[PDB]
Amino acid sequence: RPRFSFSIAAREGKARTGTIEMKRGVIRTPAFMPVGTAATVKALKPETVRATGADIILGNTYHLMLRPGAERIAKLGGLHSFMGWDRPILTDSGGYQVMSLSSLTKQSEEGVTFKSRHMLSPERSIEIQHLLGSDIVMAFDECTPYPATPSRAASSMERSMRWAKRSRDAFDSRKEQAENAALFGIQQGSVFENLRQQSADALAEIGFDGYAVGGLAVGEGQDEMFRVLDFSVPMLPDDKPHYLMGVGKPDDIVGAVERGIDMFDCVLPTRSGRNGQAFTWDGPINIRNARFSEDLKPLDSECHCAVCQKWSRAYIHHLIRAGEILGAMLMTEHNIAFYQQLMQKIRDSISEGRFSQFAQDFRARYF
Amino acid sequence: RPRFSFSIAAREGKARTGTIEMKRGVIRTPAFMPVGTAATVKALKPETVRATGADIILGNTYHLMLRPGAERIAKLGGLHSFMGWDRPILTDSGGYQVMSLSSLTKQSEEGVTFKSRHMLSPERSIEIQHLLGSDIVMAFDECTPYPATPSRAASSMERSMRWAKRSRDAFDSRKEQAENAALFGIQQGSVFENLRQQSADALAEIGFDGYAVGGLAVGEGQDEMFRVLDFSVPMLPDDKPHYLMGVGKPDDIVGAVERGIDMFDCVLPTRSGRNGQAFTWDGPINIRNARFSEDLKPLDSECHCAVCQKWSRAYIHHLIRAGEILGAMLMTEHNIAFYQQLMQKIRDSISEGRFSQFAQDFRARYF
Numbered sequence: 001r002p003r004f005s006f007s008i009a010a011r012e013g014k015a016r017t018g019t020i021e022m023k024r025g026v027i028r029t030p031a032f033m034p035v036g037t038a039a040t041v042k043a044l045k046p047e048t049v050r051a052t053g054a055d056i057i058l059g060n061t062y063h064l065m066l067r068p069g070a071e072r073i074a075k076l077g078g079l080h081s082f083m084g085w086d087r088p089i090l091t092d093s094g095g096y097q098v099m100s101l102s103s104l105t106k107q108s109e110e111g112v113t114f115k116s117r118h119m120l121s122p123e124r125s126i127e128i129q130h131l132l133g134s135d136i137v138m139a140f141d142e143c144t145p146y147p148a149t150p151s152r153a154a155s156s157m158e159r160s161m162r163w164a165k166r167s168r169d170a171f172d173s174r175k176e177q178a179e180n181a182a183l184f185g186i187q188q189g190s191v192f193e194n195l196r197q198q199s200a201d202a203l204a205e206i207g208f209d210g211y212a213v214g215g216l217a218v219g220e221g222q223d224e225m226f227r228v229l230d231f232s233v234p235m236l237p238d239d240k241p242h243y244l245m246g247v248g249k250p251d252d253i254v255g256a257v258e259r260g261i262d263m264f265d266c267v268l269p270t271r272s273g274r275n276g277q278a279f280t281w282d283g284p285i286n287i288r289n290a291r292f293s294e295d296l297k298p299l300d301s302e303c304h305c306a307v308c309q310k311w312s313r314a315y316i317h318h319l320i321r322a323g324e325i326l327g328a329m330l331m332t333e334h335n336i337a338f339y340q341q342l343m344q345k346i347r348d349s350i351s352e353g354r355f356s357q358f359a360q361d362f363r364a365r366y367f
Numbered sequence: 368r369p370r371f372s373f374s375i376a377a378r379e380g381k382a383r384t385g386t387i388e389m390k391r392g393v394i395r396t397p398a399f400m401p402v403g404t405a406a407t408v409k410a411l412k413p414e415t416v417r418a419t420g421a422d423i424i425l426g427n428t429y430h431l432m433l434r435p436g437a438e439r440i441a442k443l444g445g446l447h448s449f450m451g452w453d454r455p456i457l458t459d460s461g462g463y464q465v466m467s468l469s470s471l472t473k474q475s476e477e478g479v480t481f482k483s484r485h486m487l488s489p490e491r492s493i494e495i496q497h498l499l500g501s502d503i504v505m506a507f508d509e510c511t512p513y514p515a516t517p518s519r520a521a522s523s524m525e526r527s528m529r530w531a532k533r534s535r536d537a538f539d540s541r542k543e544q545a546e547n548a549a550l551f552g553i554q555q556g557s558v559f560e561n562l563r564q565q566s567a568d569a570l571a572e573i574g575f576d577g578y579a580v581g582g583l584a585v586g587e588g589q590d591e592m593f594r595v596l597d598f599s600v601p602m603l604p605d606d607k608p609h610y611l612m613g614v615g616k617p618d619d620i621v622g623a624v625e626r627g628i629d630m631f632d633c634v635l636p637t638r639s640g641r642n643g644q645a646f647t648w649d650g651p652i653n654i655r656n657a658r659f660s661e662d663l664k665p666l667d668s669e670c671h672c673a674v675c676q677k678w679s680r681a682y683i684h685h686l687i688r689a690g691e692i693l694g695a696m697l698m699t700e701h702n703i704a705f706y707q708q709l710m711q712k713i714r715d716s717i718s719e720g721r722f723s724q725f726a727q728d729f730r731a732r733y734f
């Protein structure tokens with residue numbers, strides 16, 4: 001198995017299906033990457049996450065660097081050993097979280113300083129991800145807040161493109177890392193085509209193992225996001241994986257794949273699960289609603305997950321309303337499993353040339 | 368398999384080891400019954416509870432009658448089907464909880480009325496346990512608060528003994544129940560020998576499938592409790608199971624078995640697990656303590672549970688301090704498993720006539 005190898009098995013319009021080979025394993029694409037903030041996919045044992053169908057999971061660098069700390073994790077043997085997941089792990093750069101869930105921050109061309117006191121930069125981010133033993137490393141960037149003027153967006157995109165250069169060199173400076181992990185570049189430019197094209201060209205110029213479409217999923221609404229994806233994805237090299245960061249609602253995923261995205265990550269599955277929202281082919285449902293109190297059917301009539309084979313909506317309804325942890329566990333397992341079944345259906349329909357039809361049938365019933 | 372059959376395989380001093388056969392399965396004694404308050408053993412899937420080694424679990428009638436309600440559970444098919452546990456389930460009568468975690472109450476010879484508005488009585492308690500599909504039914508009693516005067520204790524014990532008569536008749540009034548479940552009587556009398564003997568005689572007079580020693584584990588301290596058990600257990604018919612309610616610390620269990628107890632239930636395993644306390648052959652340890660931050664060893668060097676085979680103290684230390692649900696799950700699984708391994712060691716040493724020695728070695732290292 002190679003450090004990184006992406007091969008496309010089939011295509012239908014802009015949609016693609018294939019595999020990414022890495023030392024720790026094979027990732028089937030389009031892929032959904034379950035997220036874990038504090039070295040854990042909330043309420044799920046790694047084996048359970050895997051049984052759900054995930055080939056790779058997302059790691060939270062921001063929280064991990066604060067606790068238990070990057071150096072610490074490295075001393076304990078690395079994230080894989082620490083949380084018990086021997087398959088590929090992708091880690092975000094940490095910039096996004098800083099400008100979001102942080103008290104006060106200090107921006108500068110060198111990087112960022114945040115109290116929530118820490119100084120995160122392209123070089124530091126890359127080193128933290130290395131200490132964690134990350135398989136897919138995200139370049140350190142700046143996520144332009146939405147909305148943004150052409151000037152502010154260009155200015156930001158320009159800094160990200162410079163930070164991407166530093167991420168690239170920093171990554172190549174570590175033999176072990178450059179040799180066993182992969183580096184993904186992040187495209188910026190807000191919702192401006194000319195800027196997205198410039199970001200795309202600069203990134204390609206530097207050269208990365210994969211390209212992420214950043215700056216979206218920041219409150220622009222599906223229409224706007226899809227509009228941006230329409231002209232943005234094509235600008236990325238076609239022979240490399242396309243990763244849409246933070247996008248996860250089922251309908252967003254289907255839409256994004258129709259536009260060329262190969263990878264996804266989203267907190268909804270887990271978060272919604274604990275909030276009481278379960279996903280089904282008939283749309284999301286809030287299990288706490290009184291209508292489910294005596295409903296003996298499983299969360300979803302078709303779901304293959306263990307939860308739907310064993311427990312009823314009524315029981316889960318009870319657990320969640322009772323604040324029981326098991327409730328959180330079952331809802332999360334089903335939700336994650338649902339997302340993976342969505343991905344499997346996506347991959348199969350594309351390999352069979354019936355994806356466009358699948359997308360239609362999906363929406364019709366889902367909505 | 369019979370409705371109820373208790374046979375003793377071996378004895379060593381007052382300690383006994385054997386089995387209780389019931390339609391839903393075999394219960395190895397001495398036995399530890401994991402507790403679940405709201406139709407769930409907190410943070411554990413039923414299969415996980417079983418993998419831990421439990422032959423039977425405890426059901427919370429008090430919470431269940433309030434939510435989702437006894438009638439409701441019965442309509443959904445019964446507690447077994449509802450929570451996914453097809454093995455024996457024992458349910459307490461509900462009286463203990465009322466006089467404890469309830470706002471205001473109204474006592475009377477008929478039963479009790481509590482707002483937390485409900486009227487629970489011997490007859491109602493028995494019917495609720497029936498609707499839940501309970502395998503081992505506890506008679507409805509009054510748990511004399513500690514400390515108590517001889518008069519107040521006798522007065523209370525006398526009411527319990529009357530309520531036990533009503534529980535007995537109520538239970539025998541339901542063909543289905545009397546035919547498929549078992550009824551356990553509860554001994555009272557506070558810490559008074561003459562009262563414990565009277566309660567014991569009255570209970571035996573009525574006749575039950577098993578006898579519980581109630582009134583203890585109410586803040587009397589181990590010395591006092593053991594003192595009471597010394598003269599109380601022998602008064603119970605020797606050919607029936609002896610159940611010490613609410614007792615669970617490892618040392619209490621070993622001590623109680625040395626005095627003739629066959630069954631146990633306790634919230635500590637699960638509760639302590641979420642609080643950060645893990646049990647080991649070297650005594651409890653609070654995993655949150657800084658000393659465990661980089662400890663790669665498992666919770667216990669000997670524990671056979673899945674948690675100790677897969678994760679480190681350091682990782683669990685992280686999860687709990689991070690408020691992660693997985694932390695609660697792993698700690699609980701290990702704790703429950705530890706208790707079951709304790710019981711297995713108890714049963715094996717007794718079958719082999721080396722229990723007294725085991726008890727010594729256990730304490731020496733545990734403390």
Ligand SMILES: COc1ccc(CCc2c3nc[nH]c3cc3c(=O)[nH]c(N)nc23)cc1
Nearest residue numbers: 035037060092096143214215216217245246
């Ligand atoms: C806690 O675990 C994680 C949670 C979320 C993420 C993705 C974060 C994220 C975005 N999310 C929405 N839009 C985004 C956009 C971006 C973006 O443009 N750049 C980066 N680096 N990240 C983005 C990574 C890990």
Ligand SMILES: COc1ccc(CCc2c3nc[nH]c3cc3c(=O)[nH]c(N)nc23)cc1
Nearest residue numbers: 402404427459463510581582583584612613
């Ligand atoms: C939530 O699930 C459960 C939790 C605890 C219990 C046992 C409750 C209990 C006692 N506990 C300590 N001393 C006790 C003493 C008693 C007692 O004397 N009688 C009864 N009926 N119960 C007692 C049953 C179910």
Ligand SMILES: [Zn+2]
Nearest residue numbers: 303305308334
């Ligand atoms: Zn399901």
Ligand SMILES: [Zn+2]
Nearest residue numbers: 670672675701
């Ligand atoms: Zn263990």
